[PDB]
């Protein structure tokens, strides 16, 4: 299917990626709208992350699951590729943080638990995803939680290419140490508390401090966060990957179960 830039009628915007911008985008023949993901080769060659964007494709077109960005294709020009992304009408994750603060238990829960079921699909092919963060979860029509960019995925046992915002990496993936499926487990950690408190808990005014926090785990809750959701951060955020819990035992959690939808 050799899709060219003239199959499509462009629109706004979307969003802000590193290598260029996603728009929205229809396609002129069905009128079927999704998002137009453009990079720039001369960026994306120098950055020297052209296999990521390999595996993006490889991985995310491949991949099948309701809380999963499906990518449908791909084509290039002289100066651009262009993924062909499902468009993800509600916006990020990031956004609704924004606009929210911090979310209720329920909403928190939920996307816990759409995060664990797509997670769980994705390593029971041994693909790990490595680069869940906020920005990269999006909201279908029905505000169902979609995982998108598989731009830094690979098939376990990896190594690592360089960094950004450590945010939401575990101490072995920044270490440069070797890493599995735990990886995921970790982010799900943080972004449970993210959701819960309004901002990650290793969030430090420079990446060197944000390492050092990382690396000996060092975090505390605000006192609004309830004991069940404690347990459960504290369960996910350890430094010993092999301590981490299963994806199955985040979904049977009592406070999951009790709060998500
Ligand atoms: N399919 C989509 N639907 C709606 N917005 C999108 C979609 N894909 C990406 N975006 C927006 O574009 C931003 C960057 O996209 P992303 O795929 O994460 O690029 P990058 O790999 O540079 O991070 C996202 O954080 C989001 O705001
Ligand atoms: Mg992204
Ligand atoms: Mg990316």
Redesign the pocket.
Known sequence: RQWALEDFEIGRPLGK??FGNVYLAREKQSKFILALKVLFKAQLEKAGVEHQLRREVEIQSHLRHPNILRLYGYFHDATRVYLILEYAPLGTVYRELQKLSKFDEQRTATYITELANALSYCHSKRVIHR?IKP??LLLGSAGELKI??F?WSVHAPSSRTLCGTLDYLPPEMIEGRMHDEKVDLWSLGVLCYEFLVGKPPFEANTYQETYKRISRVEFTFPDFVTEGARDLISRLLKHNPSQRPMLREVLEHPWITANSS
């Open positions: 990626g590193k680069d920005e990269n998108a960019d731009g």
